[PDB]
C-alpha cells in the first residue's frame, strides 16, 4: 500500500549537515505523475516550502534557500535522499516528506522530528525531569488545608521515563498534565504542580509524593516541592 | 563496453560562487500535433538527430497498464521547432525541451488546468510552444505572445465541379 | 446536434465523397488538411474572414520577464519574411493549383 | 478617466465628415435602422496643407 | 539622429494616451509602443484598374 | 557597444580584481579615456594580458598622449590617437589668431 | 550521450599527449556524429601566459 | 513572493453548529487553493483542492466556497473529528506559502482563575539564583496577564510565560510564570508580588510570597 | 569505419592510378583524392517515357 517512512538522526549539532530520507510506497517515483515533495513544520507554528520533484524528474526548491537544499529521488527503492548542510540552530522542530501528485495539495506521512542545538551527551536540562525535595519550614502550614506536590528543574538526564502513579492521580484533583516544558532562552528549565486534595488525604499515614524511577543509575527517586 | 547514466538529463550545477541564477535555460513542454510539432524515433544506426530537428525527452510508461515509465530520448520535427531554433538562437538561451504528459492543450476542470496550460500554470515549464489557440479564458491565468499564424471557427466546402 | 462527426477523417472521407455539403472546424488544421489531400477537392474560404478570428501563440509564465523578447523577435522574424518562407517549408505549399478548366461534360438540358 | 484619443482619416475604419450647420452631427441610421454612432471629432483643416 | 513624426511622434510625445486606427504592428514600433491583442488580422494586397 | 569599463586605477587591491574584468574583453575595438600617467600602467597591464596584439584597436584621446614630445617609447606602434594641431599650428599663428 | 557535438580541446606537454590528440583526432574522422573540433590547443601556462590567455 | 494573512487567529464556534473561516491574501489571479484540516499530535489532512473540489473520504458538511480573494470554509455541524486547526495555500507564485491557521474549541465560557505562588527554594538559592512561580490553573479563556511588582513597580524582561495547550477533560489552562531574581535585589527589596489580569476578573487575586 | 568501395574505393587502396569514367566532381571525394580540370561539363536530368 501507499506507506511512507522517513529516516534521520534525532539530534545534531549546529552548522553541520543531515542527510534524512523518506520512502514512498503504493505507487513508484516515475508512475507518470505523482511525485514526493517535503514540507516544514516549526512547532507550535505554520509552515515553510521546502521543495518536490514529479515522476517526470523534475525538481523546484524554496526561493529563500537556494543554497544549501539538495534532493535526489531512487525509483529503485522508490525513495528520496535530502542533503542539508550548514544546519542552523533555528532548525529544531520537524520534517515531513510527503506524496506529491501534480496539484498544488501534497499527501502527507507521519513526519520526524530533529532536534538541533547544543544538546549533547552533557547538555544542561533540556530532556528529562530532574528532582527537588522538601526543605523545612513552619510558616505557611497553619491555617488552610495541606498539599505536597513535587519540585522539578535542571534535567538533562533523558535516561529517565515519566510516569505519575498511573490509577492513581489522572483525576484526583490534579492538572499534573497540564504544566508542560516551559521553554526558555538560554536552556534553563524548572516547573511544578498542584493538587487541590482534601485534608484526609495528607495525614492518612500515606504521604504522596512523586516517584520515578531512573534507570541511567536505576533508582526509584523521589521528590515533593519545598517551602 | 556499455554506458550506463543516473541521470537521464544532465543536472546544471553552480559554478564556484556566484549569485546568478542559470536563468538562461528553460524547460519548453510542447504537445504532439503534427504538422506543428511531430515525433520521430531517434536514428537506430548512428543514435542522433538530424540537424532540421531537435532532441527531447518524450516520457513513455513502461506499458499501456504499467504506470512505470522513462523519459526516453526522441526526436523533434516540425514548424513550431524551427520557429524555437530560430528564438533561441535570436535570443541566446539554451533549452530542454519534454513532451507532454496528459496529452492534450489543456481546458478548466473544476477549477483546475490540465495538459500543456496545466503543466506551465504550476510554474512547472516555463515557456509552452505548439499548436496553442489564444483565447480569453487562457489569458486570464497565462500571459501569451503575439500570434504568428491565424486560426478560426472556419468552414470548407467540396470543391464543386465547373459549370 | 444532429451533424456530428466522429472524427476529422470520418468528416473529411464525407466531404470526399459528397456525405455533407461542407465542414466547419478549426481554420488552420483545415487548411492543413486542404494542403495535402489528394486532388485538391476541398477548399477553405475566407482569407481569414472567419468568426473569432484569433492566432496561435507561445505561451509564458505570467509576468515572466521573457514577454518583451519573446514579442520583438516574432515581430521581426515576421516583418523581414522568414515567417512565410518557414510557413511555405512546413505548411500547405502542395496544392496551391488554378482550377483553370475542368472537362466540360455533356451539356445537359 | 479622460484618455486623449487620436486617429487618422480611413475608411472604412474612421469616417471623417463636417458637422451640421449648428455644429451638431447629423443624425443618420443604417440600412437595419440601428442609430449610426458619433464622436466629436476635432480635427486640423487637412484640407489645404499650407 | 532619426525619430517619430506625426503619428507615433504625437503618441509618444504623451499628447495622446491611445491610438485607435488602422495600426499596422511591427518590430520597430513594437519596440518603443505597446500594442495590444490584434482586433483585426490582415495582410497587403495590391490594387488595380479592373 | 560591448561593455562599458569604470576603473578605479588608484586602489591597490582593485587590480586584483580589474585583470578580472579586462581579460573579459574581447572586442578588437576598443576606446579608452584615461591620463598619461594612467596609460602607461593600463597599457602595460594590457600587454602583459595582450590587448596590444594583431586585431586590436585603441583609440584614445589626447590626455594619455600629454606633450607629443616627449614621445612614449612603451606604447606601441599601431596606437592611433588624437591630439590638436600642435606641429602645423604654430605658437605665432595662435597668438596672432587670438589678438 | 547528452548531445554536447561542439567541443574543443586543450592540454599541455605532459606525456603522452601526442597520443591522445592522435586518438581524437582518428576518433573524430571516423565517427558518422560529425564533432566540431573548432581548435585543437597545446599550451604551457609556465612560459608566457600572455599566449595561453590568448 | 505571495503575502497571505490568515482569519484572525480568535475562532471557535460550539460543538454542532455552522462556522465559516476565511484567510485573505493578494487579489491577482489565484483560485489554484489548497485547504487542509489539521490534527493535534497527528499530521494535517486535506479538507477541500483547488477551493471546490473536496478530497477523498471527506463528509459532506465542509463546504468549500468562495473565489476572488475570499475563499471561505463553511461547517454545518461541528463534530468531533472536526476539531483541530485549518490551513490554506495559494499556488500562483512561484514560492508556495501556507496558512497560519485557528484552533477550533467548544465555547463554554468560564472564567474562575486559581492562583498558585512559590517561592524560590534552597536549590537554586545555593546556586545563586531566585527562581519563584506563579500559578494560574483551571481558567479557559485564553485571556491570562500576569503583573510582577517589586517596590510597587512592574517588572518586566525577566518573566516568561508558559502558555499552554487547550485540553478535551475540562477545557482549563495551567500557566506557569517563572522570575529569575538575582541576590543583590533579593537582599535589597523583600517582598514581590503576583497579581493576575484577566479579561473577565474586575478584582483579581493578587498574592505575595511569604517569608522564607 | 567509413570505408569506401567502387572506383575511389579501388584507388585509395593504390591498386589503380587514374579512374577514366564519368565521374562527377563534389566535395565529399575530392577529400581522398583529386580532379583534373573538368573535361566535360553537364548536369542532372530525368527520363520519362515518351
Ligand atoms: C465532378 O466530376 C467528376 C468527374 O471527373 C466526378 O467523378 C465527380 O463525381 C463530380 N463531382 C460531383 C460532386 O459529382
Given at each position: 500500500?501507499?506507506?511512507?517512512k522517513?529516516?534521520?538522526?534525532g ?11 523518506c520512502?514512498?510506497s ?11 515533495g ?71 506521512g ?29 510558616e505557611?502550614?497553619k491555617?488552610?488545608?495541606?498539599s ?25 484533583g ?13 536552556s ?36 515533593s516541592?519545598?517551602? | ?21 542559470d ?45 512505470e ?29 519534454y ?8 481546458k478548466?476542470?473544476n ?33 501569451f ?19 | ?6 472524427g ?102 | ?23 451638431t ?26 | ?19 485607435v ?14 500594442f ?15 | ?45 594590457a ?5 596590444t ?16 614630445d ?30 | ?9 586543450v ?30 590547443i ?13
Amino acid at each position: 500500500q501507499v506507506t511512507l517512512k522517513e529516516s534521520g538522526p534525532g539530534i545534531l549539532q549546529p552548522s553541520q549537515t543531515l542527510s534524512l530520507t523518506c520512502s514512498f510506497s503504493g505507487a513508484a517515483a516515475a508512475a507518470a505523475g505523482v511525485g514526493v515533495g517535503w514540507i516544514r513544520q516549526p512547532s507550535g507554528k505554520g509552515l515553510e516550502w521546502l521543495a518536490h520533484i514529479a515522476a517526470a524528474a523534475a525538481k523546484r526548491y524554496n526561493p529563500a534557500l537556494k543554497s544549501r537544499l539538495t534532493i535526489s529521488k531512487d525509483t529503485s527503492s522508490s525513495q528520496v535522499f535530502l542533503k542539508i548542510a550548514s544546519v542552523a540552530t533555528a532548525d529544531t522542530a520537524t520534517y515531513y516528506c510527503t506524496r506529491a501528485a501534480a496539484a498544488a495539495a501534497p499527501y502527507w506521512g507521519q513526519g520526524t522530528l530533529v532536534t538541533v542545538s547544543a544538546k549533547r551527551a552533557d547538555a544542561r536540562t533540556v530532556a528529562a525531569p530532574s528532582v527537588f525535595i522538601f526543605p523545612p519550614s513552619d510558616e505557611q502550614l497553619k491555617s488552610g488545608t495541606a498539599s505536597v506536590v513535587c519540585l522539578l528543574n535542571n534535567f538533562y538526564p533523558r535516561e529517565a521515563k515519566v510516569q505519575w502513579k498511573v490509577d492513581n492521580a489522572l483525576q484526583s484533583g490534579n492538572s499534573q498534565e497540564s504544566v508542560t516544558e516551559q521553554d526558555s532562552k538560554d536552556s534553563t528549565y524548572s516547573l511544578s504542580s498542584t493538587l487541590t486534595l482534601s485534608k484526609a488525604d495528607y495525614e492518612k499515614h500515606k504521604v504522596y509524593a512523586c516517584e520515578v524511577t531512573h534507570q541511567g543509575l536505576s533508582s526509584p527517586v523521589t521528590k515533593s516541592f519545598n517551602r | 563496453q556499455t554506458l550506463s547514466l543516473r541521470h537521464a538529463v544532465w543536472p546544471r550545477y553552480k559554478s564556484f560562487s556566484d549569485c546568478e541564477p542559470d536563468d538562461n535555460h528553460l524547460s519548453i513542454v510542447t504537445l504532439e500535433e503534427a504538422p506543428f510539432v511531430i515525433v520521430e524515433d531517434i536514428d537506430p544506426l548512428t543514435e542522433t538527430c538530424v540537424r532540421n530537428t531537435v532532441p527531447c525527452r518524450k516520457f513513455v510508461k513502461i506499458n499501456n497498464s504499467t504506470n512505470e515509465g522513462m523519459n526516453v530520448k526522441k526526436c523533434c520535427k516540425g514548424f513550431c521547432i524551427d520557429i524555437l531554433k530560430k528564438l533561441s538562437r535570436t535570443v541566446k538561451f539554451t533549452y530542454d525541451l519534454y513532451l507532454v504528459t496528459n496529452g492534450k492543450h489543456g481546458k478548466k476542470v473544476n477549477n483546475v488546468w490540465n495538459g500543456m496550460i496545466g503543466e506551465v500554470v504550476y510554474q512547472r515549464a516555463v515557456m509552452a510552444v505548439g499548436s496553442l489557440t489564444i483565447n480569453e479564458e487562457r489569458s486570464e491565468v497565462v500571459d501569451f505572445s503575439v500570434p504568428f499564424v491565424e486560426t478560426g471557427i472556419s468552414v470548407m466546402v467540396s470543391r464543386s465541379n465547373g459549370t | 446536434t444532429r451533424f456530428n462527426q466522429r472524427g476529422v477523417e470520418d468528416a473529411l472521407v464525407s466531404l470526399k465523397t459528397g456525405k455533407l455539403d461542407a465542414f466547419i472546424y478549426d481554420a488552420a488544421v483545415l487548411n492543413y488538411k486542404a494542403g495535402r489531400d489528394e486532388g485538391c477537392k476541398l477548399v477553405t474560404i475566407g482569407s481569414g474572414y472567419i468568426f473569432a478570428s484569433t492566432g496561435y501563440g507561445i505561451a509564458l509564465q505570467k509576468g515572466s520577464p521573457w514577454k518583451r523578447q519573446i514579442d520583438l523577435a516574432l515581430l521581426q522574424f515576421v516583418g523581414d519574411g522568414e515567417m512565410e518562407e518557414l510557413e511555405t517549408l512546413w505548411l500547405t505549399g502542395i496544392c496551391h493549383n488554378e482550377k483553370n478548366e475542368v472537362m466540360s461534360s455533356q451539356l445537359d438540358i | 478617466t479622460r484618455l486623449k484619443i487620436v486617429t487618422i482619416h480611413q475608411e472604412p475604419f474612421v469616417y471623417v465628415k463636417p458637422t451640421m450647420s449648428d455644429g451638431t452631427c447629423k443624425e443618420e441610421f443604417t440600412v437595419n435602422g440601428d442609430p449610426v454612432k458619433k464622436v466629436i471629432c476635432t480635427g486640423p483643416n487637412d484640407t489645404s496643407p499650407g | 539622429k532619426k525619430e517619430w513624426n506625426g503619428m507615433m511622434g504625437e503618441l509618444l510625445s504623451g499628447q495622446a494616451d491611445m491610438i485607435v486606427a488602422p495600426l499596422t504592428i511591427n518590430n520597430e514600433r513594437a519596440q518603443y509602443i505597446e500594442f495590444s491583442k490584434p482586433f483585426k488580422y490582415q495582410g497587403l494586397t495590391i490594387l488595380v484598374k479592373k | 557597444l560591448e561593455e562599458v569599463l569604470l576603473l578605479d586605477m588608484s586602489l591597490d587591491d582593485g587590480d586584483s580584481k580589474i585583470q578580472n574584468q579586462l581579460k573579459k574583453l574581447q572586442s578588437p575595438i576598443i576606446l579608452l579615456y584615461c591620463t598619461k600617467e594612467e596609460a602607461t600602467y593600463i597599457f602595460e597591464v594590457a600587454n602583459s594580458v595582450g590587448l596590444t596584439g594583431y586585431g586590436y584597436t585603441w583609440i584614445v584621446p589626447s590626455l594619455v598622449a600629454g606633450d607629443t614630445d616627449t614621445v612614449p617609447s612603451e606604447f606601441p606602434t599601431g596606437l592611433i590617437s588624437v591630439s590638436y594641431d600642435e606641429w602645423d599650428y604654430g605658437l605665432p599663428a595662435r597668438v596672432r589668431d587670438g589678438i | 550521450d547528452y548531445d554536447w557535438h561542439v567541443f574543443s580541446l586543450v592540454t599541455t606537454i605532459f606525456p603522452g599527449y601526442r597520443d591522445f590528440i592522435s586518438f581524437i583526432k582518428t576518433t573524430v574522422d571516423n565517427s558518422f556524429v560529425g564533432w566540431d573540433m573548432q581548435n585543437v590547443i597545446t599550451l604551457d601556462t609556465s612560459f608566457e601566459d600572455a599566449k595561453t590567455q590568448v
